[PDB]
Write a protein that binds this DNA or RNA. Sequence first.
DNA 1: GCGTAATCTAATCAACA
DNA 2: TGTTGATTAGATTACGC
Lengths: 56, 56
Amino acid sequence: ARRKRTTFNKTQLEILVKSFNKDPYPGIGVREHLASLIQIPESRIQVWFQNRRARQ
Amino acid sequence: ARRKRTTFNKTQLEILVKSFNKDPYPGIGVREHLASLIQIPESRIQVWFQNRRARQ
DNA sequence: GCGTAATCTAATCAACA
DNA sequence: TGTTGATTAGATTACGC
């Protein structure tokens, strides 16, 4: 079975979109910073960035 | 920009290889169980399983 | 129901002994 | 220098709202 679908609120999405507009390929440091900031596991943020680059 | 390379000891590798021989496609439950068991983040275990299925 | 999170493979890079 | 963990680009499948 798959994990439960991670849900992002308005603030988390806004922060992630700003970070994406700054750099679409964030290193491990910035990814972990975003993880601690919006309280979302770093793996989920990496998946989000991959999907975001995929739609764009 | 990459994360530090995850290092596995003998026991972690043994448990992961046993789980792989049992099921090469573990669900989220089994992955999180292995994560809690060998104390390694679930994303690292998913990456390890992907690489293992890739080289075999 | 749509958007998008999650997952898999295939290919490539690089780092820690 | 080698093994193998880490990353990314595509295709998918399938929940959360």
